[PDB]
Structure 1
């Protein structure tokens, strides 16, 4: 059976020193967690789990669990992983790289530095979180009240506004963009409202 998104673990003791450069060659975009060394282990006596890396590997096309497993073996050594699980929520796995996800936070796992995350081949978690249809409607309606409230005259004035106070309403630039897309028509109405409204004084 086939899918695009996988994760597996890389073990420092059975991967070459140029491993980080070697994953880069696969051409596939990857995100690699900070070195997960301080994982509380549930074996008796021993303090932390063997030291490991978590990798978020997104294939170009829909491929199988094993096509990856052997693509990585023949690239880092037959002994580097064995356990390739298929990833169901890319956003969630990316947050898991730092134990900062919903699953991991409720399991109180040892939170890592998101700055240690390594992005091979231009991973940007941003290109993997599109939004629920309802969400789109919800945000759009916020964009409305926003253009209303501050009498934003045009999509530049809107962007400038989001640039600053963005987070407060939970918009970014690249987000408004995905929100207003297709509703453009409706936008020109708002922006004319605002224009001819500010022309009143």
Structure 2
């Protein structure tokens, strides 16, 4: 029930305006997706999912997803995050940030620009695969 690689979603309405600088205070590598403003909705009668970011988070040692959730809530506020997911395939999850994983492309998801990925704490995907 512990892991090193995690992902979670952040939504503009429920994060502080200085959320990115606050993540920059943590001591773990992260990759932040481009803004996902054009993802297809799962809600009957809507077109777009609520604009959000995806964060790929690399713990230093094996930890629980709950521990990561509590850490981000203490940093960004209780309303900032509902849950944290474990990542088992870190390369595919990195590519998912721009919907360029094989599964994202199979599902015809909206492709984003890799230039809009933000790396914190010298994230380098080659180290984690």
Report the CA distance between 1:42 and its aligned residue: 2.0
SS of match in other structure, 2:78: coil
Q: Which residue of 2 aligns with 1:96?
A: 96
Distance in 2 separating the partners of 1:84 and 1:35: 18
Report the CA distance between 1:99 and its aligned residue: 0.1
What whole-Å deviation, never above 9, does each CA across 1:118-163 have from its counterpart, x for those lacking one? Answer: 0011001121xxxxxxxxxxxxxxxxxxxxxxxxxxxxxxxxxxxx
Distance in 2 separating the partners of 1:47 and 1:23: 30
Report the CA distance between 1:101 and its aligned residue: 0.3
Tell me which stretches of 4 or more aligned residues in structure 1 moved more than 2 Å. none
Report the CA distance between 1:48 and its aligned residue: 0.2
Distance in 1 separating the partners of 2:80 and 2:113: 24
- Could you tell me which runs of 5 or more consecutive residues in structure 2 were left unpaired when the two chains were aligned: none
Report the CA distance between 1:102 and its aligned residue: 0.8
Q: Return the structure number with greater helix share.
A: 1
Report the CA distance between 1:51 and its aligned residue: 0.9
Report the CA distance between 1:81 and its aligned residue: 1.3
What whole-Å deviation, never above 9, does each CA across 1:141-194 have from its counterpart, x for those lacking one? Answer: xxxxxxxxxxxxxxxxxxxxxxxxxxxxxxxxxxxxxxxxxxxxxxxxxxxxxx
Q: Return the structure number with greater strand share.
A: 2
Report the CA distance between 1:26 and its aligned residue: 1.1
Distance in 2 separating the partners of 1:6 and 1:58: 7
Question: Where do 1:1-201 residues align within 5 Å?
Answer: 1-127=1-127
Distance in 2 separating the partners of 1:12 and 1:32: 13
Distance in 2 separating the partners of 1:111 and 1:4: 27
Report the CA distance between 1:46 and its aligned residue: 1.1
